[PDB]
Each structure stands twice: as C-alpha cells, then as structure tokens.
UniProtKB/Swiss-Prot annotation, chain A:
The lineage of its organism: Eukaryota, Metazoa, Chordata, Craniata, Vertebrata. It comes from the Eukaryota. Belongs to the proteasome subunit S14 family. This is 26S proteasome non-ATPase regulatory subunit 8. Component of the 19S proteasome regulatory particle complex. The 26S proteasome consists of a 20S core particle (CP) and two 19S regulatory subunits (RP). The regulatory particle is made of a lid composed of 9 subunits including PSMD8, a base containing 6 ATPases and few additional components. Interacts with DDI2. Interacts with TASOR. The chain holds residues 235 to 350 of 350 of the full protein.
Curated annotation (Swiss-Prot), chain B:
Component of the 26S proteasome, a multiprotein complex involved in the ATP-dependent degradation of ubiquitinated proteins. This complex plays a key role in the maintenance of protein homeostasis by removing misfolded or damaged proteins, which could impair cellular functions, and by removing proteins whose functions are no longer required. Therefore, the proteasome participates in numerous cellular processes, including cell cycle progression, apoptosis, or DNA damage repair. GO terms for molecular function: endopeptidase activator activity; K63-linked deubiquitinase activity; metal ion binding; metal-dependent deubiquitinase activity; metallopeptidase activity; proteasome binding. One of its GO terms (biological process) is regulation of proteasomal protein catabolic process. Coiled coil: none annotated. This is 26S proteasome non-ATPase regulatory subunit 14. It comes from Homo sapiens.
C-alpha cells in the first residue's frame, strides 16, 4: 500500500492490527505518510481550499494544518492556496552540457586512435 | 639523391696503386649505384660521403611552419554541406554493405591464392567499406567537437 499511492487502505489497516494496538509504530508511520502526501500535492496544481485537506485523513477541523502550512509553504491568501512548479528556467541550456559533451567526444577520439 | 664526386688521377691507374688510402670504415657505408658504377665510378672518379647540418632554429622555423593554419580550428565547415556529405557517403555503404554479403559466402574456398588473385579486377567491399567508415567517424568527431568547444569560447 505504501509502495503505491493507495493510502485510504493504510488508515483502514491502522484500525485493524493482528498483535496489539501496535501504536508504538503507527506513530512512526505518521511521519512517513503526511510528509509524503504533502510532497505529492506540492506539484504545479491549482488552488485547494481548506476543506478537502482538512477533513480528508482523520481530523475534522483541527489546527494541525495551520502548523502544517506554516512549516511547509502554501502561502495564505483569500482562501487561496497555490502550488507553483516551473522547472523551466533551469532546463534549456547546453553550456553546462558543452563541457560534458566535449569530454564525451574526446573519449571516442581517445579510444579510436591510441592503442590500448 | 646528391652523391658528390671527385676525380681520380690517371697516373695512379697507370701506376695501378689504389687511391684514397682508406684509413677508416666510414666511406664504405653506401653501396655504389649500379647505374653509376657502369660509368667512371671508382675508375675515373670517386664518390665522397655527403651529410647535412641541421639546427633547431633552422628546423623549428621550417618544420613548425610548413603546414600550419591560424584559426581554421574553430570553423564549422558549412554545416549545411556537412550532412549532405554524410548522406552521400552513407548511401554508398547501403550498396557497399550488400555486396559485402555476396563477398563473404564465395570466400573461404580452396586455393586462397586463387581467391587472392580473384580480387584484382573488382572492388573489394572489405577495404572499401572500411575506408568510408574511417572518414565518416573522423569528420563528425571533429565537426561535432568544434560545436561544443565553440559554444564555450564565445559567450
């Protein structure tokens, strides 16, 4: 379930444990789930109101997200949350590729002329 | 090919005494040419060893000068014409390669010397294909390399 995105089952299993409460570990998973869920939603999506993210996992209307938003981004606006991802300024460059490419071709020349 | 010479006296031959009074194994290093021997070589004239004087100022001002260029290194050789040259050469390997198949089956037969002499009238794809490949790899390796080298030297 963790390997794929299926998480609604994880909380369903969180309430069904074979040995005992096992809460000494489920608390550990909380760190490995919420951090992942926030990261996924961090992509270049549009505004998401504080109504889906609030009542989604287990809680109705807590203050955790307020802290959650504070340590993450999600700039606060007119009930407007943004998640912008460009990854476009960095790409589209060959000067750095130029040095890598120059080494590459020289190796072709190196291993084409000199005797090994 | 110089072979500087000098005359021998007719009196010596009349006397019969051999000239040049060899006192070192230095002059008998070059075998006289049979064409020269036919004429008056060692009969009417004797050759003198010829060597040369060379110094770095002379050499460095000739060897490092004859075939050189100033800025041709960073020239991309008519990028439009470069790929056209590739197309013509590669297209020749399409037919050349096909003849390679027909040149492998009939080979490895008896009397390879007969096979060796059988390649004296018709193009051999074994060598022709390699020749084209050699030029193809160097032309692009140089042509491609200048592309990245220029992209950093100029802005």
């Amino acid at each position: 379930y963790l390997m794929e995105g299926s998480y609604n089952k994880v909380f369903l299993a969180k309430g069904n444990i074979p040995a005992e409460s096992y809460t000494f570990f489920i608390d550990i998973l909380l760190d490995t789930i919420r951090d992942e869920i926030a990261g996924c939603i961090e992509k270049a999506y549009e505004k998401i109101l504080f109504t889906e993210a609030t009542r989604i996992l287990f809680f109705n209307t807590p203050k955790k997200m307020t802290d959650y938003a504070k340590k993450r981004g999600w700039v606060l606006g007119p009930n407007n949350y943004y998640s912008f991802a460009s990854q476009q300024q960095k790409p589209e460059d060959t000067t750095i590729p130029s040095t890598e490419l120059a080494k590459q071709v020289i190796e072709y020349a190196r291993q084409l002329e000199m005797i090994v | 090919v110089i072979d500087a010479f000098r005359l021998i006296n007719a009196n010596m031959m009349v006397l019969g005494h051999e000239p040049r009074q060899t006192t070192s194994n230095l002059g008998h290093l070059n075998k006289p040419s049979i064409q020269a021997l036919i004429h008056g070589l060692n009969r009417h004239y004797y050759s003198i060893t010829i060597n040369y004087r060379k110094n770095e100022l002379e050499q460095k001002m000739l060897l490092n000068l004859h075939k050189k260029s100033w800025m041709e290194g960073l020239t991309l050789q008519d990028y439009s014409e470069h790929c056209k040259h590739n197309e013509s050469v590669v297209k020749e390997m399409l037919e050349l390669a096909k003849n390679y198949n027909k040149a492998v089956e009939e080979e490895d037969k008896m009397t390879p010397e007969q096979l060796a002499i059988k390649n004296v009238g018709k193009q051999d794809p074994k060598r022709h294909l390699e020749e084209h490949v050699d030029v193809l790899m160097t032309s692009n390796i140089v042509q491609c390399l200048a592309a990245m080298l220029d992209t950093v030297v100029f802005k």
